[PDB]
Amino acid sequence: EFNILLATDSYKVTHYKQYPPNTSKVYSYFECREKVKYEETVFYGLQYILNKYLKGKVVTKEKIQEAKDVYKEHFQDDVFNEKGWNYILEKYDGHLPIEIKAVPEGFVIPRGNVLFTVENTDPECYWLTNWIETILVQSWYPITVATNSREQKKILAKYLLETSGNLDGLEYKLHDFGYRGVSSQETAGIGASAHLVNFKGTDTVAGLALIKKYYGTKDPVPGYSVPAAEHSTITAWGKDHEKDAFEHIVTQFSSVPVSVVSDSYDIYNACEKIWGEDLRHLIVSRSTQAPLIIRPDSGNPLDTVLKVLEILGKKFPVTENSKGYKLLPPYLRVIQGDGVDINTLQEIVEGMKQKMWSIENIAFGSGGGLLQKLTRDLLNCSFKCSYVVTNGLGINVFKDPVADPNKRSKKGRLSLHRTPAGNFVTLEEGKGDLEEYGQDLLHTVFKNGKVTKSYSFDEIRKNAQLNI
Amino acid sequence: EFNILLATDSYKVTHYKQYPPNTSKVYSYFECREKVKYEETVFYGLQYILNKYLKGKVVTKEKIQEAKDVYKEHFQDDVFNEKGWNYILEKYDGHLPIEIKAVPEGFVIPRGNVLFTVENTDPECYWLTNWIETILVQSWYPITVATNSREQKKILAKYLLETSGNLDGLEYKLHDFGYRGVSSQETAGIGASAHLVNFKGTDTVAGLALIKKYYGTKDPVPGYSVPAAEHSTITAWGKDHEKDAFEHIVTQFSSVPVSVVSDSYDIYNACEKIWGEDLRHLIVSRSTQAPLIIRPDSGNPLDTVLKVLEILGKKFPVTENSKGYKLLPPYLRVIQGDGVDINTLQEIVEGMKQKMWSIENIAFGSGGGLLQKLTRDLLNCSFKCSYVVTNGLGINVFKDPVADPNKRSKKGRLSLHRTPAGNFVTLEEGKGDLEEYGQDLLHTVFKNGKVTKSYSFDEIRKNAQLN
Ligand SMILES: COc1cc2c3c(c4ccc(O)cc4c2cc1OC)C[C@@H]1CCCN1C3
Ligand SMILES: COc1cc2c3c(c4ccc(O)cc4c2cc1OC)C[C@@H]1CCCN1C3
């Protein structure tokens, strides 16, 4: 049912009429333009797009007719290029005559570098390069989710290492709760998969299926969850029976970790009186492999975390780890899953450290902040034409708006290189062909309807690892 | 290839073990909780979800086995409720034993009112009400896009009325440019469909297909566009040939409206020297039905709009309308489609009014600001359990967190009524059954796998009209 002829910005339908006459090549590129800092970006998600939308026979006689009929009404005019699309159907069996070169998935690249390039492989299809901009520029989302997720991992690693002396359990310190808070089922899958580049905990089941279909893992699944209560399973017992709900849930899940939302009526009373006194005998009996994870879900996230830890530290036996930081017993942990984004995550771990609480005690859950409150503007994700051939001559093209030099685009044929210090540089104006900086790091990943280079999710996770 | 058994928050897989024993009924509701204020919301998008995801045979033996295999690995344990899902397959031929009642689509409802309710119709399926919360709560996105778009329409209507004395072309004053700035193809269609509740201009073609399939219009399409240049079609001509690019494009599109991005190198030079002198002869000759629409795309959105209008006003014949506001000639208009969201739109029309420019002169295009930069928290969209039947006894259920009184949920069986002054009131604790108000405004839209009541896009548009 997907029709690539109907998967572009409307105005692109009219572009074949606007290019200079005798244009044989249009060459475009994607970058996260330069200027939390977000100095480096995780390149993730293009392989999903190539496989789901671009590869194989994407043009049929029925798809051309459907698009002709929609655009006739949408524009109230006959501007649709049926001839160009028929050419692709008849000459290439509806395979796109396009070459895409990209940096490997999971690579961590500084801002302002070429990440992928797109060009037509047939001169008659000069107009196709920018037709597919809309579908390829959506790459911004998994790039931005993967990047923002990795930036939160860097904060958790710094504070976990300072307060505990190791990074054990780091991949489980940020759990994806974003399924309800995203705009669609398709978005849930894409965003959850991008989070699983960096972490292993997710409630967003749609992410597992996407990874298995488009990337692959050695392991049966790329992420995991544990049993957890919500407000409906506590509040269903009645206002006077919160203790009965808690006793039932921890007894049902006595041998596995279990998360219990504790703020239905009064989080402080739940921690001090219900967990800390009435049900304490059911908690101190649990295995190290099956902790109670208390989940506050309302109020000021920092103030609530600090008060919950002070409460639990007075009702349960607290130890002092080798770094001097307080540690709850191994059958008891906290997860803060409300109001968490990269800024509040920083504030909580810093406030915990100042009160001498180990980051071993806490994990975070993020919903909207992890998968929804991100824009194409956060990393200045941009797709621009840099090179055309018109009357057999290559010309270097760019924009350079007077009022915003940050929107200046790169000129000519691009390539990505290692510098002598081992950093990245993007060469412009075809200067990569001089091989003063060695070989281009971009690889052909799509050519003429075929995916030509692919990466497993395992390779992507290894590429995206923290420097440590 | 969608499997409703795999379309929930993972933890919901475990909830059938957490509810009180002898629970026969779980009843839950959606609202935009009370605290631009966004005092009223456009209810839009549930019918999409009911038809795409919830209706008909959604359970098969193969879907149950697939779910069982995934959950075994995801939890490293066998917690999946295979028996519950098998019961629905055998007893209802895989149709969901759920009743959903909703306010009519397009209705504009004040914050803090019930918009829809969900309950199981079979006692064995008490667990199913909140299993489908994840899919249903995503209704927040079309509600929020439709609501934010209508709030922008209110600002434009106010300023167009004060500066021009009428609302002609209001439905073409905010164009959807959001396709590349959203997170997915599916989000693009949903968001574009929500904008078309209020406006007619879109570049997001995916919205048209969604409206045709799930809602329907008397007109062949719900939304329109005009030819437009992008930086690629101007810059491809070369840095020294911007004039040649502009001339080619307006000549190819001489008899239709055409938008031309004019900031590739220098927006001010383009307006004053290229449009205003070198190509002025190809502009002043155009039909009122085929204006040149100049599109700045960089800089401070307010400062750039006001400077562009000042430039054009010195190069082209400006009139003064009956309200005393300046009006460009009919063959010349402007569209600002960079940095536009609800706050900047207000800043620009207010700044224009202060410089005595009519809002007739300007349209807005919005991308990320219109379809992407919105969260479930903006309208406090929430799905909560309000009523359960345990041991044959009905109990009013709710949350009331000590630290956030704004997160208090409603109690018991709910109903939506007209007040004697013609406002809306949500009645709690089954008090709607006393019939002290008129009829419940919630109608059954889904029952036992069937969509029971459908709205056309034309009725939705009429419900969402401005006062
Ligand atoms: C021993 O303490 C813990 C164990 C887990 C386990 C998982 C887990 C998944 C997501 C998440 O957000 C947290 C956790 C977790 C948290 C714990 O303590 C805070 C999944 C794995 C699959 C088999 C064994 N499971 C253990
Ligand atoms: C006469 O001036 C204008 C006309 C239009 C027309 C459309 C239009 C669509 C989207 C949009 O954002 C703007 C416009 C527009 C803007 C104009 O002036 C600024 C679509 C319709 C389909 C047949 C006739 N078209 C006219």
Numbering used by the authors:
A (entry chain B): 8 to 42, 52 to 484
B (entry chain A): 8 to 42, 52 to 483
Quoted from the paper:
As an important cofactor, NAD+ is involved in numerous life processes, including cellular energy metabolism, DNA transcription and repair, and redox homeostasis. Therefore, NAMPT is closely associated with tumor development.
(13aS)-3-Hydroxyl-6,7-dimethoxyphenanthro[9,10-b] indolizidine (PF403), a phenanthroindolizidine alkaloid, has been identified as a promising therapeutic agent for the treatment of glioma. In this study, we identified nicotinamide phosphoribosyl transferase (NAMPT) as the target of PF403 by using thermal proteome profiling (TPP). To explore the specific binding mode of the surrounding amino acids, we also performed an alanine scan and molecular dynamics simulation to identify potential key residues. These potential key amino acids were subsequently mutated, expressed, and purified through an E. coli system, followed by nanoDSF experiments. Our research has identified a promising lead as an NAMPT binding agent for treating gliomas and revealed the precise interaction mode of the NAMPT–PF403 complex by X-ray diffraction. After NAMPT was knocked down with lentivirus, PF403 lost or partially lost its antitumor activity at the cellular and animal levels.
